[PDB]
Amino acid sequence: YQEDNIEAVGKKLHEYNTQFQEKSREYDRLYEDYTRTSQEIQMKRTAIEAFNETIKIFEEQCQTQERYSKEYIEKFKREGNETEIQRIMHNYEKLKSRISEIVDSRRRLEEDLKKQAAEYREIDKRMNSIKPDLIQLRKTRDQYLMWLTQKGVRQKKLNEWLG
Amino acid sequence: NQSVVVDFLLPTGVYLNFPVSRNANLSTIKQLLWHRAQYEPLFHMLSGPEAYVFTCINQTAEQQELEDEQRRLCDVQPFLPVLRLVAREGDRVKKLINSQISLLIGKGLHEFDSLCDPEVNDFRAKMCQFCEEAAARRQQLGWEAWLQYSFPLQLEPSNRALLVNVKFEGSEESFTFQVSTKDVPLALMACALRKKATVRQVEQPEDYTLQVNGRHEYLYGSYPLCQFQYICSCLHSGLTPHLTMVHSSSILAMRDESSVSLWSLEQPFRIELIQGSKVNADERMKLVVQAGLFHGNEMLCKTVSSSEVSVCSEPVWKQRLEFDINICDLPRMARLCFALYAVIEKAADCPIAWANLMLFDYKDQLKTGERCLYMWPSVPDEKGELLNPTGTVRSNPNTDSAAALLICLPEVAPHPVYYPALEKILELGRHTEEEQLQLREILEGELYEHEKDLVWKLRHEVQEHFPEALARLLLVTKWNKHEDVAQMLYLLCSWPELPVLSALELLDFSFPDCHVGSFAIKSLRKLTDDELFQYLLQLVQVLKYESYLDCELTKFLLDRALANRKIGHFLFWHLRSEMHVPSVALRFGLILEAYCRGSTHHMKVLMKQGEALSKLKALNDFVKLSSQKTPKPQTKELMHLCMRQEAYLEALSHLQSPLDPSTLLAEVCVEQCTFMDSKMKPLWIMYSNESVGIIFKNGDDLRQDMLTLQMIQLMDVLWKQEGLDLRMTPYGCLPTGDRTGLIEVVLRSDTIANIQLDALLNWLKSKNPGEALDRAIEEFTLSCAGYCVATYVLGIGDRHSDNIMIRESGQLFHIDFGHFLGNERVPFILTYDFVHVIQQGKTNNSEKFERFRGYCERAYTILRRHGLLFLHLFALMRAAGLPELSCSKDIQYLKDSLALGKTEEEALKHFRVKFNEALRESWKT
């Protein structure tokens, strides 16, 4: 209570070791992309916070422009400088349009982070579909190696098969 | 182009937009703004330019008040070219330092606030206070104290008449004269004063200190002169020391530049698994959640599993997982650990992800209510365990995209419950010849269950007679029973102080309890700064095993960083170089912030260094990108033109070296700068001051080499402590960033390959003509022995002529330690061509060869005596996740190579046989 020739099992040890090393390489490629994508997405997230902070600054400017303007709009109206009212207001229109450019650039980044978030998820998935094969090949490689060790196969022949 | 269009927001609400040069400093930009603002509405209401400070959004997404207006806009690096004028006044010192810290640590301080985490908030408040207090205390103390803080003595591990050149600060003329090798530095200062007064005359010698010319290295204190590293080095080389007398004021100028117990709750621990989210798995498979309770690496009870639900993104379970342990028995550091597994339906299981949670929080409260544990992906490792209890308790910071599990700890009492206080633990914790003989042999090493119960019974005997066995006793304690825990902690609190070596073992993941780590640190407080420096890298990696942010080890490292600027220098870089690693970003960021608040001076040194490093990164990326397209000579010239740009040249010049902050990297020797032909195209950057070189590598992880070099350094120190100077070259290597670091250039050196174009012996003759050759050959012999033994013990193979180098002194040294611990046994190796030099070019010179064999054997013998030190240090380095130092088999390599399981006589007999076999092997190859 508890199989073939040595040379046939040893060939299969070599084949399974070659397949384990190759699946390993694939996993390490995906993991490098996983790491890189993780870092990139966090950089994009902090850059979005940076847009938000810049947009926030610009809206303080608008509030400031509106409060601060009044007196000098009303002063130049009584004093006949509708021309100086006109400069202040045109200057403010230029401020507003520049805000819309920055908002548009923020939106492009959010859209790119949406794609790269999906990319991250697909990498994680590809990785999780490899792990069963990678682990199964590691175990088979070891079971063959132990079978040969039990049968008394010397270390030198084992090394030839492991590459 | 140079020019960039910049948005200006004036405080009147007016907006201007115009092109400025990227090189222009903010002061120049402010002048151009003012000149343009006068032709725009509402100018008359602005105060002068000097009443305002520019504000920008910086790369870390924080608003930054730009006080230094000599900074160039390219250096500032605003997120968008948007400068807002804002009132100058406020607490401008705090604003400046807050903003510098964010840029220096590579993480916005706002990212800590955004978390809305009280533990973080309490860490920052408490630690920043304590560091600021220490920094303010430091300022009060005398110039002596400050000199010791900033420039601690560089001493050898540790009579002839040789001469020294002495000068004064701001004086062309020098004074050459002899003093004793064994004279204390006071006596040199007193002499130069008399030499000054004799040739106008007159003040005391204790008003002064001695500086090494062109270095921040200073000679003071009660030690003799030969014990200083500059003097020892000079004396051995035959060169005359060049010193400067610096007055005390000149050093001050640098300084001024409720009613429910936990033990009443006798019902099982349990959790509600609710849902997972953002799972990405094979649709055909089914999902399962394995859960287990842990203390360190031991299970508190048997693991319990959820049911199989079909794979989807948002799987729902809604199960009560009940564990075989009552709430009253949970230890303080009890760890709830999860692994999400995809499995083929019941009719290789994929480990998807894992997450750990402390069951009590940082204030000793048993957690209640919901938690969202953002998970880390499981990596398929060799020892394929279900759960990952050694993993960090911190949540994955990629909350946007990472998988998560929702759980709920049920409310167990009406009022909140704490882990009992120390007083109530010591309350509960109180209370033959054959078994004494059986305890003895048991403490001479995996203990089995029958032995565990014996040690437990005779725990009082272990404390009385075997205090060095504390670690064994802590592992035999049953941490899933609050009575046994109570009894172990009782003993622990009256346990005698253990030596450093023992303390180091107690810092490992096996000993999570907060009382143990506190006892360990309490034993590490004996450390001198020089010894602590030897272990700094390991103490830092051990922070990744901590459960809470506010811990004893962190406080200890900050204390020592605040008292010694060199320790703080290297603490900063060991932390900074991992700020890209998401499992430690938060913890290291918090330590770095607190460190910075206690050291605003060094912060200025660190800022200058981080900028040099940033220029080099960009410079190295250009060189990589050019190498693929164009040949080397052209690429080399294009590197130089990029370097001579004002903003490059300034940021690359006049900094303290990160490799050694006492070394000043003054003027960049641009024509001598180049890049090496290796795969990552590392930069060779030469300097001249009062010649030094650095190598900037980006693309490789340099941590292996640093560890290897740290250990060779340690070996050299251990050898030198027994009076054996093996003339090693344990040069600087320092990870600075994401796969980035610096390597010290060893001057006047060349590769064995280059010299071999016998030739080795001639080279030495041509570099040491006539009567200097016996020195050179003896330097070669001593260093060949040391590196033969070092590389054998550490298991460093692939030792070839491209990665072995020779100094013109004769000293031989190894480089490029990418591989160690046999990553088969690496035999002890002698090289025939090295034997030929050792034998003075002769076939058979037994006298010399026997001396070399002696040097090898005494070297090996000394390491064996400190074998436990190397095992402990390597054991703690497993925290670093180096692929070649991941398991106890890696540690076994060191046990075998140092032959610790054998007596000294047996070990040395085996070393001899291996030595002899290597001499036999030498000829054959």
Ligand SMILES: CCn1c(-c2cnc(C)nc2)nc2c(-c3ccc4c(c3)[C@](C)(Cc3ccccc3)C(=O)N4)ncnc21
């Ligand atoms: C101790 C640090 N260090 C390293 C080093 C590198 N990388 C790692 C991971 N560790 C150590 N190499 C070093 C070298 C060095 C290595 C190879 C070599 C030369 C010098 C010359 C002689 C000159 C040379 C040619 C072209 C470009 C640059 C230099 C040559 O022809 N080949 N000299 C000093 N110190 C070094």
